Amino acid sequence: LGPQMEALGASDLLLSEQIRVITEHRYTPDRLQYKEGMKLADKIAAQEAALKEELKVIYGDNVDVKHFQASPRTPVQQLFDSLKNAAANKERAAKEAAAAASPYLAYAVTKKQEVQADPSNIPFDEVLYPQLSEELLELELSDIREDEIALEKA
């Protein structure tokens, strides 16, 4: 089994770099599913850059994106990461509105920060679109269920 001795989410590598060592192990490069597996590792590495950039503004540059890919932060931890940078966010907006080029732009960098610093304005896709986030759950629950039917047949 080799790389398949540990689960898809339960390694120490990031998920995009684990899909690569599972696909290199299960298939030879001749195969179709090697090509479709290395392309999936690009769609997941695209989601790990977009998660690094989303959390770079809070946890620094050594963000440890593996911890938040596996277990994302709850709506309460998104709140307490808003509030633990809000004092340096309200003071950055006040230092930028003072040095904005015109009193149109000075109102625009405070009105944007007055909306962006409120944690109730963080868009939760599960709160906004409830039928979408359940169906995005049943894309991965149906991918697993197809691997569980293959083992019940075996």
Partner: protein, 61 residues
């Protein structure tokens, strides 16, 4: 031939047919109209440092 009972459409081909277009940000309409209305402020306000009112209607002195 157990692989022929798996769904032939890949996990990749799901993620590129479900997430086909990069979605429009909520804030990209603000920060694109604000930078364009900052030129409406500059040229056309009467308190801006670069008004066009002395360039298009020259003052009678």
């Amino acid at each position: 031939d157990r692989v022929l009972s798996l769904p032939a459409v890949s996990k990749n081909q799901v993620l590129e047919n479900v997430f086909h277009t990069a979605p429009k940000a909520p804030v990209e309409h603000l920060e694109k109209m604000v930078s364009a209305n900052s030129k409406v402020y500059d040229a056309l306000n009467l308190q801006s440092k670069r008004v066009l009112i002395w360039q298009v209607k020259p003052a009678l002195f």
